[PDB]
Design a protein around this ligand. Structure first.
Ligand SMILES: CCOC(=O)CC1(n2cc(C#CCNS(=O)(=O)C3CC3)c(N)nc2=O)COC1
Ligand SMILES: [Br-]
Ligand SMILES: [Cl-]
Ligand SMILES: [Cl-]
Length: 269
């Protein structure tokens, strides 16, 4: 009884770090935007299994963790064989893993008569990824706290957006480790910026994790510089590696990408 579900990516339309929390760990402000860029997930009745087309081991897979935890918290034994075709590259700063977790858990929770409630499902996926509960609502939301405290917003942003993803996998942990006092802003500063972005002022986007990721991973910087050369303002999603801009891909971009092994994703918002 196999079904297919799409699992969307996000971009961060701006990110600010307010400071360190005892638990690791950083308080942030960000604007999440869902983008029409999807992993395809085939769910079939069978023995619990989570496979991808890109060799993520089952034990490492957020979706598998999530479904084992579902078993724990619910006392129901899950009989679903999961295959995920990963178009959203891990380490691209687009929340593909967290998306997979949220959508699969939401689906399996329905397919099993809805044992968990909206707030529980959210606490479950949220426990694994701070990221992950944005994907239970989608569209556009402000993330506060560590990204889990969400406020749905209506954005005045539309038209072409292009993603340029280099074949470096940004380690978010290594990015947060280059953070210094100098990178933090006040929440009031960030809230004014986000308001402006929400009203369609894309030039107000900025992200210190991107600034850092460009220093640590020279290839992110190479893409950034290339996008400027092409005559667009570049921006960085998550803590990289993705660079995006508000325009279309030229043939010269497509050529540079094929040659360098960058993925170019043209979308419309
Ligand atoms: C143990 C030390 O490492 C960390 O805690 C850094 C990490 N982190 C991650 C956070 C997050 C989040 C979700 N929003 S987001 O768009 O994906 C943003 C790119 C992080 C966060 N708010 N604070 C953090 O400190 C854990 O994943 C990166
Ligand atoms: Br610091
Ligand atoms: Cl079978
Ligand atoms: Cl690099």
């Amino acid at each position: 009884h196999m079904i297919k579900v799409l699992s969307p990516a996000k971009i961060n339309l701006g990110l600010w770090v307010l400071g360190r929390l005892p638990s690791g760990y950083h308080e942030i402000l960000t604007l999440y935007q869902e983008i029409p860029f999807y992993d395809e997930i085939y769910i079939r009745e069978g023995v619990l299994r989570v496979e991808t087309n890109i060799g993520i081991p089952q034990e490492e897979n957020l979706v598998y963790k999530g479904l084992r935890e579902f078993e724990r918290i619910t006392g129901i034994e899950i009989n679903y064989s999961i295959f995920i075709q990963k178009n959203i590259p891990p380490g691209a700063g687009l929340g593909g893993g967290s998306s997979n977790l949220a959508v699969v858990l939401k689906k399996v929770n329905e397919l099993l008569g809805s044992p968990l409630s909206e707030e529980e499902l959210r606490e479950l996926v949220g426990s694994i990824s701070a990221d992950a509960p944005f994907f239970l609502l989608g569209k556009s939301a402000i993330g506060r706290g560590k990204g889990e405290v969400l406020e749905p917003v209506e954005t005045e942003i539309s038209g072409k957006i292009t993603l340029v993803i280099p074949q470096v996998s940004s380690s978010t942990g290594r990015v947060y480790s280059s953070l210094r006092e100098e990178h933090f802003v006040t929440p009031e500063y960030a809230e004014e910026k986000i308001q402006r972005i929400i009203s369609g002022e894309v030039e107000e986007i900025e992200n210190v994790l991107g600034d850092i990721a460009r220093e640590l991973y020279p290839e992110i910087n190479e893409v950034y510089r290339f996008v400027e050369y092409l005559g667009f303002k570049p921006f960085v999603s998550g803590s990289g590696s993705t660079v995006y801009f508000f325009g279309g891909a030229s043939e010269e971009l497509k050529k540079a990408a094929k040659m360098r092994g960058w993925k170019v994703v043209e979308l419309e918002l």
